[PDB]
């Protein structure tokens, strides 16, 4: 098991805020709806409200009756995140003791509700009673996407089994998760003619495959059957056959299904007894249907459906391949609803990162690491307000919007949000996981190989070996990454040659001698390491312009792995949003800010102006790096346009990921005088 301490100050703050937020939740309030539906004493507690409202006005903080709600979804994410925080290195010993006690109380409380519910309703024994079993699988009575909500609890239980230090808690989580899988099988055999894939079910196949790994031998086949009930093979077949069926599909609905296809692959290939239990046909389909569907999905998404920050979707859906400008700009800027601002739901990138991660673990292809790094910085890290810890729903791509974050719904950050009842969007629930597990994908151990997935100052150890690796990195503020190795034994360090680096300037020095950048068949350079190894890896950052396939005149700028944004106008977090959907905050457009994002070359064409951008961002470039590399931290990166007219001439471009106090431009409108 990896242990990774994080020395990067921006990521330390991000992770510490999340631990504080997780600690602000009370177990009895998380447990209210489970208890109520199971007939157990609720101790007069209220649920946390918003998407965690239930049907009953006396238990809902806002007093509403049968509101649109997603009961259990955020409780499930909280179990995941509080578990992840036990494994991660942001929480102190004392924070971990308290959060672990809280996790144990929630896991035991849900198990108790499950068991009490099973006696009230034997036919549905094993159901997690977050809401009425009568609305499975399509919802009803204001309860939306039941299987999606249950998926979070089931996924949560696996994380608690994996990461709780409390033996009873692990055993309780396993019993709960296996009993829920048995429920899925019993429910579906009783409702054999009911389609349970038409309504969003989250990553239920994924979670159940993960349950099969933890189940007792005599339960595995039952859990595998449950998992496979949630494999949408008709979708997978289309994808495997090289179709792009995505136009009109809900994006966050779809992505986790393919992570579940990959979990099937992993579950069967990593347990020889399971692998051997398949037919020859089934065995071949692991590769020809499941892996192939996921590989092809990932590729079509990144090539044809992805914005410069690694994100996808508009109004929560995929649209026409390549029509990114159209989706981001031709859907209105009026306040409220889901319009231009509704690009790049943040859940989608949490899911894309998990898909890239399991594709990496199976294939070792460096392209998945390049994507991971890019999207982790420019969509996930970018999603957080560094003062509050809260996270985004949408990420607008058209210029002139602010970033809008959620609220706590707890006494955390009361100086910002006062006594307001929380909302607990999906994006806030994936959000808490993003920051609880923030250090889980820096390095991957595989036999005596150690893959460097991202470049961050950190220290890596693993209980399976006796080497310690300390990385110091600041890219792209400074260009040298160093590694220092201590301990005993040997290993093979695997390094990516980033596409974002100026290729001819990349240099690898190992123990004071330059090494060639020879790649293995998966794209990795390999360095033998042992005690006292010292590596300097020079990665000069490339400045580049990235347009949309459907509009050469809508252009974002990126320096090394950091997408830049222009700071346009001041924003006020108290008034800069409206509502859309179910209690979702959506950004309000600033048309004066948008007007500043016109990039008008003083002389010549837009094409010639773009050609005059230099990769090294030096004097003479049409976009010039202005910060001193040797002063300030990474977020002090700063750029200015040159040879342009109007307001853009005076703007600062800085990292998108750290921009939150102003409206911003990621994509600029290139225009002739
Ligand atoms: Mg796992
Ligand atoms: Na083009
Ligand atoms: Na001001
Ligand atoms: Zn979401």
Numbering used by the authors: 379 to 1051
Anything the authors wrote about it?
In the present study, we characterized a GH146 β-l-arabinofuranosidase, Bll3HypBA1 (BLLJ_1848), which was found to constitute a gene cluster with AGP-degrading enzymes. These results showed that Bll3HypBA1 is a β-l-arabinofuranosidase specific for Araf-β1,3-Araf structures. The crystal structure of GH146 Bll3HypBA1 consists of three domains: catalytic (α/α)6 barrel (aa: 379–820), β-sandwich 1 (aa: 821–920), and β-sandwich 2 (aa: 921–1051). The Zn atom of Bll3HypBA1 is coordinated by Cys3-Glu residues, and GH127 and GH146 enzymes share this structural characteristic.
To obtain a clone suitable for X-ray crystallography and biochemical analysis, we constructed Bll3HypBA1-NΔ379CΔ761 and Bll3HypBA1-NΔ379CΔ933 without the LamG region. The crystal structure of Bll3HypBA1-NΔ379CΔ761 (aa: 380–1223) was determined at a resolution of 1.75 Å by the single-wavelength anomalous dispersion using a SeMet-derivative. In the active site of the NΔ379CΔ761 structure, a Zn atom coordinated by E723, C725, C804, and C805 was clearly observed, and a Tris molecule was bound to the l-arabinose-binding site (subsite − 1). A Bijvoet difference density map of the data collected at 1.280 Å wavelength revealed a prominent peak at the metal site, whereas a difference map of the data collected at 1.300 Å wavelength, which is above the absorption edge of Zn (1.2837 Å), showed a significant decrease in the anomalous scattering ability.
